[PDB]
Amino acid sequence: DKPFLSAWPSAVVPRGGHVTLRCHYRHRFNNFMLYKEDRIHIPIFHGRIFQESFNMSPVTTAHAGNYTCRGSHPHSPTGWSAPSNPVVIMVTGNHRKPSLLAHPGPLVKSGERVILQCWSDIMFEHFFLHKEGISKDPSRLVGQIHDGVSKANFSIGPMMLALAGTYRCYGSVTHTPYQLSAPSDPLDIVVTGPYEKPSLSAQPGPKVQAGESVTLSCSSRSSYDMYHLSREGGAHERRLPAVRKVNRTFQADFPLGPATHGGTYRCFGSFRHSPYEWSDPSDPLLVSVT
Amino acid sequence: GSHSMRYFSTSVSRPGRGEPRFIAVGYVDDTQFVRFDSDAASQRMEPRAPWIEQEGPEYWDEETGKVKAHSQTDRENLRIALRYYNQSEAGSHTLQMMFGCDVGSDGRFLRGYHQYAYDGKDYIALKEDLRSWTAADMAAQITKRKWEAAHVAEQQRAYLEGTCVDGLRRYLENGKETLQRTDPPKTHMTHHPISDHEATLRCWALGFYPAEITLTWQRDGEDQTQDTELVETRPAGDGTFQKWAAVVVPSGEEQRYTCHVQHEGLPKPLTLRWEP
């Protein structure tokens, strides 16, 4: 019937990298022709038939486009299949990277929402939000213009594990929509819960004198493999492996060094091989500095 | 007397051949009544039996929501299993889920099930008390440790004892005439000569419901359970089932062998003898 077009290892590919288009049809990656969607019904490359794969390497801006393939069908009225599913090759690294930040924050309760805003002093027409590792096409929004910046609000939610991970975003100017900016700095989005909260304590305790060093200890009866300590409002985020103590409590001890000043802290448990889903936050603990 | 409800779901990865595919199917006894196909155009839980076609839109709205949620959870589970087993993102893999319940004809709970397999072997399963999990390998004990910290068994036990056995009761009433009927097996025998000293007696059971049935051969009144050939019960296609059993008999000794058919639709078991 209709072939399956796929890009490996991903359709969002940086300029100078490599991507391979394969057209699986009739139980084989057999010979096929390619069609970009400005010329729907005549094949690109002057009718070139591809033997196995189409390896584009190195990737140029010319490779950016919206592709469909037809597989070879010898014993058929016309010699070829129906058009495949479309695949958009997006070439990154053509403009300065925009900015990406999450509202209200990157730690999202399960089932709730979060806003990912991309903005730039470059005036982009479209913004693209993309989670790393998934082969779903990135989400596109039109860039709103406001006092000399282009921006767009991506709504992520209601929060599930399939939506947690590393997000980057991109911009495209008006006439090269498949040519994307350099990726913004990555932003990790974490779903919290519904794993039971750990407990957070301080030793010697929560009140410390200036210049003196305190440590925070996260503990749980559940077998978390790592613990994450978050200062409230701050970007001070660390992670530590859990250790089985003498009873089967799992614990990690976060030292804070000399206390310039102290805020409130929370801690989360996370499990092995799943780093973007954390437990519910611990009870808050405020460290006061005299 | 006893009745059962089961949901079977299959999630399959196929890199370069298509996007991951999810198929779920619902059974009461031996009768399928719903299906969901992630690759179908509907994108909805579909009726597959006449007696459930009459549930309200809110039923189909709600079942579709949770089966689509399952179809998306188990497709992220395929990705996690690659990390658990350090497996290539290039190979294709299977994730199977079985869930359901038994009730007696007294009407209430006897047993619940909620188990998983990865690439065709056991992964994790809720055991009989509905309070703990059995993990088949080191990877499933990570899932067990997660599910303990999330108090999952407590939620699935509540669903099992509540929404599930009382949905089963509604289905049994809505379709009792098809689900609680018993169509008896029509029987006959065939005779094929293998050799000059060898013959094959085959005994047929056709058109019976439910699928459970017993075919036993007897020579001068004791069983030949390792000498009889038994085939898997097969669906007729109309909601009934078929099965046959065969003996290899010394030629001229057909008189010796009797076939015995037991089934709930039969008042008494049948004992059948061959003649040319």
């Binding site: 594990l161 799943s274 889903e277 | 949901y7 779920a24 619902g26 839980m45 079942e63 949770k66 089966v67 949620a69 399952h70 959870t73 188990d74 992220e76 589970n77 996690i80 299993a81 658990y84 889920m97 869930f99 909620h114 990570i142 899932t143 997660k146 599910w147 999330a150 999952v152 939620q155 699935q156 669903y159 929404t163 599930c164 949905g167």
Partner: peptide, 8 residues
């Protein structure tokens, strides 16, 4: 009735 499902 179709159940809840949880992540691995």
């Amino acid at each position: 009735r179709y159940p809840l499902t949880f992540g691995w």
